[PDB]
Amino acid sequence: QSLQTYVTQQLIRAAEIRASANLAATKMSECVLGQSKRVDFCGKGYHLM
Amino acid sequence: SNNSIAIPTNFTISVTTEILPVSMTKTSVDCTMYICGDSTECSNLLLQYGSFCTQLKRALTGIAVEQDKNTQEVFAQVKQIYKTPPIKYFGGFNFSQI
Amino acid sequence: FNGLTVLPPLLTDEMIAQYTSALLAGTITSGWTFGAGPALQIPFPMQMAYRFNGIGVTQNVLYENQKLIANQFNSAIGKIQDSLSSTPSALGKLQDVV
Amino acid sequence: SNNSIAIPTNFTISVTTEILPVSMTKTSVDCTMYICGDSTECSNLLLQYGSFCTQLKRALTGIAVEQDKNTQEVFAQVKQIYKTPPIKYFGGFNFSQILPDPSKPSKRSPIEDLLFNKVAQKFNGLTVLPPLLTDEMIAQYTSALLAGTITSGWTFGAGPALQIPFPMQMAYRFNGIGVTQNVLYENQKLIANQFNSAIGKIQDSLSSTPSALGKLQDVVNHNAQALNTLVKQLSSKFGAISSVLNDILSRLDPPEAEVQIDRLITGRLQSLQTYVTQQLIRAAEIRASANLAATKMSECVLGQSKRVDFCGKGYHLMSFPQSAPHGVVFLHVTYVPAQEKNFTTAPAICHDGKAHFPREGVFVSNGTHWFVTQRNFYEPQIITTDNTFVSGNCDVVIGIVNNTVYD
Amino acid sequence: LPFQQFGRDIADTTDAVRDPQTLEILDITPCSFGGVSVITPGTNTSNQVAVLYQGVNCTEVNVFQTRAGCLIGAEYVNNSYECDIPIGAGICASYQTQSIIAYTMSLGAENSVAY
Numbered sequence A: 001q002s003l004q005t006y007v008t009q010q011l012i013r014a015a016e017i018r019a020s021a022n023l024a025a026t027k028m029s030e031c032v033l034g035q036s037k038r039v040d041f042c043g044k045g046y047h048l049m
Numbered sequence B: 001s002n003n004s005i006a007i008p009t010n011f012t013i014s015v016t017t018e019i020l021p022v023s024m025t026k027t028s029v030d031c032t033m034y035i036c037g038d039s040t041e042c043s044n045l046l047l048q049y050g051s052f053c054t055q056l057k058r059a060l061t062g063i064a065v066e067q068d069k070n071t072q073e074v075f076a077q078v079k080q081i082y083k084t085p086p087i088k089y090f091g092g093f094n095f096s097q098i
Numbered sequence C: 001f002n003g004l005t006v007l008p009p010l011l012t013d014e015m016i017a018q019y020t021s022a023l024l025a026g027t028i029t030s031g032w033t034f035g036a037g038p039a040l041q042i043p044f045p046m047q048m049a050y051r052f053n054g055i056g057v058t059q060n061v062l063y064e065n066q067k068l069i070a071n072q073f074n075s076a077i078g079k080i081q082d083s084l085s086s087t088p089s090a091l092g093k094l095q096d097v098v
Numbered sequence D: 001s002n003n004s005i006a007i008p009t010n011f012t013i014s015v016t017t018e019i020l021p022v023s024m025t026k027t028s029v030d031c032t033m034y035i036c037g038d039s040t041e042c043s044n045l046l047l048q049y050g051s052f053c054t055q056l057k058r059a060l061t062g063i064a065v066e067q068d069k070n071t072q073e074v075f076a077q078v079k080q081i082y083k084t085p086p087i088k089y090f091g092g093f094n095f096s097q098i099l100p101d102p103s104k105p106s107k108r109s110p111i112e113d114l115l116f117n118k119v120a121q122k123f124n125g126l127t128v129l130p131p132l133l134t135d136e137m138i139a140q141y142t143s144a145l146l147a148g149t150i151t152s153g154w155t156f157g158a159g160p161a162l163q164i165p166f167p168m169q170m171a172y173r174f175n176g177i178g179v180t181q182n183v184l185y186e187n188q189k190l191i192a193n194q195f196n197s198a199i200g201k202i203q204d205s206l207s208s209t210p211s212a213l214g215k216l217q218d219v220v221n222h223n224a225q226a227l228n229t230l231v232k233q234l235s236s237k238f239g240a241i242s243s244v245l246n247d248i249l250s251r252l253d254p255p256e257a258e259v260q261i262d263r264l265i266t267g268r269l270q271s272l273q274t275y276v277t278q279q280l281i282r283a284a285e286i287r288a289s290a291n292l293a294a295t296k297m298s299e300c301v302l303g304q305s306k307r308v309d310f311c312g313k314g315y316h317l318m319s320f321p322q323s324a325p326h327g328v329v330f331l332h333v334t335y336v337p338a339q340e341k342n343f344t345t346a347p348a349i350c351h352d353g354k355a356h357f358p359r360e361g362v363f364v365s366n367g368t369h370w371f372v373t374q375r376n377f378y379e380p381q382i383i384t385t386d387n388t389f390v391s392g393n394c395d396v397v398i399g400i401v402n403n404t405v406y407d
Numbered sequence E: 001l002p003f004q005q006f007g008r009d010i011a012d013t014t015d016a017v018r019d020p021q022t023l024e025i026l027d028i029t030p031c032s033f034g035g036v037s038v039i040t041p042g043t044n045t046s047n048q049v050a051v052l053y054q055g056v057n058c059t060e061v062n063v064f065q066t067r068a069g070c071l072i073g074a075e076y077v078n079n080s081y082e083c084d085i086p087i088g089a090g091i092c093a094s095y096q097t098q099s100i101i102a103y104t105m106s107l108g109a110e111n112s113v114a115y
Ligand SMILES: *[C@@H]1O[C@H](CO)[C@@H](O)[C@H](O)[C@H]1NC(C)=O
Pocket: B001, B002
């Protein structure tokens, strides 16, 4: 029971970390590899670099 | 008002910091060692109990492979490693800190 | 320890640092060209002229105020490290994950 | 260096494939039959365990309706079924591989048929529910989207479908990425040949490497693994004398029968709960994938996206969807510069005491003469007053050079 | 093979068995079963309901055979409308006028652009 609870908690944390990593990859692709016109996606203000 | 507008006459170059988690620690557990340790009869009874150990091991392995995939997706965007020129002059910009 | 084992990440800290350095060098020397294909060399002031032209400001604004913009960017970069040092809570997300 | 720029003198068009899972099989589990078979005494004992069975039923129903909603959101974005005109000439562009084939009864494109070809449990009270949208209707939606994006451009996405010749639509898309439409009008034949070659190579790449379609296969394998695990754990002792319920019923005294039945119940309830939790987690992952796929369909297919690397690698031109089992395949058409050549560049031109900046493009020099060209393509032009604005003086700008401005 | 009779499949279930008379081997398949679902409009609208036996052939058991299952209490209509109540593989039921009718759902209006 304890081990299954730990595995379920790890799976939920892994899903959260997926969401965060997908966001990080999108920001790397948009903000670093180019200039993004999306408001507040890359910092506050008009994004430059 | 009907008739008034505001136009900026100056600007500020502001640098902000954003921190994002990417991957977490990869952990693997030995189900037999955790539950029974070195007891042989305990291991036999656990084998009689069911096959949850294989499922849990598969779940943990999948989690580890994802973490690795997450790091790969985040940081391996470029196909070629680029080197900066030996002279670090970029028109007055200072990237020594970066 | 007790049957719990921690698997090391596939990509070491040095390799992630090399990826970061490659990305920084590509951004500095080639603008966004290296992301959409082969890396194209370009002077940094002209890259920032493109970037200003993107946000709706003519490049003459950058060219007239190149030194001031460089000074402001350098000051912001220098202040970033001090801001990170002053407040350890900035890495709170990563610390919370661990 | 401080005064060197590189500008591409040529370009290539690359078509890449992006595969995203969209939906997973809908499964309904009968609590009573799975956990107790056809014995009424076991059902009576399970009755007093509470409302676990209805909770599991509600969770499974929610997962099924979520899968249906995901498929509908991803594929049913368009409101009218558009039909391709019978005469299939599009200025040298060949869409035979992605348009549906009337000859085959499936009404599927050759790529769709290749994808479909590339990719027991009922006996214990577990049932799989048919999807709301059949493969025929999903293929019809995909064909409607393809017809809309081929004949109407991006106009049908934001309102009524507007007629447009395909070369003109491609010229507008080229203007979208900062390249003048002349480039397309003087290289139409080369561009069409490159696009046709890339489309032909797409099928070869998919057929040769089966690992490309690995995501959908992994989803199906995971589902089969979960179902097999449930069926296998139906035979676990769980501390009882035997796994067969009828044997215990006809073999044991009523109190010991109740004890063993309760043990088996506890085991099967925890097994079902674990299975349902795994099912919910996988459903959440599939929902995230379907949301990403719907966003790509809205942005990559129904329009031109300025986001880097979101729609293929390189400067996005357009995209084509393709139906796949439990997923969608996106063919991203992108513009990739090639054959770079370096040039000497200056920020501005100093004429008669006035600076000159390029209205669009940059100033380049080939050694003796100065020209202005667009950023992404190399077409030198005489530096004239029409494409330059002065806006300042000569002393302030750093790196300015002397040259004459024609008028 | 002559060994014994307790035939089993991958599902660890008694798929096939031999009888103590002929050595005839009979495959054992579970007796037909499924879940029953009640397709109903709003209660204030009407009290008529349709019953869908999903995964059950109509022969085993007005009566209409869908690939999702056996649908009784609804009359099939050739004309296609937008989906109102999901039923299964492309079939949707709605209360149209006095009775509940099942139809193949229509994706949308057919529009041809004169390219
Ligand atoms: C705009 O003008 C109208 C009359 O011309 C006036 O009533 C209104 O107050 C004006 N707007 C504002 C914000 O004052």
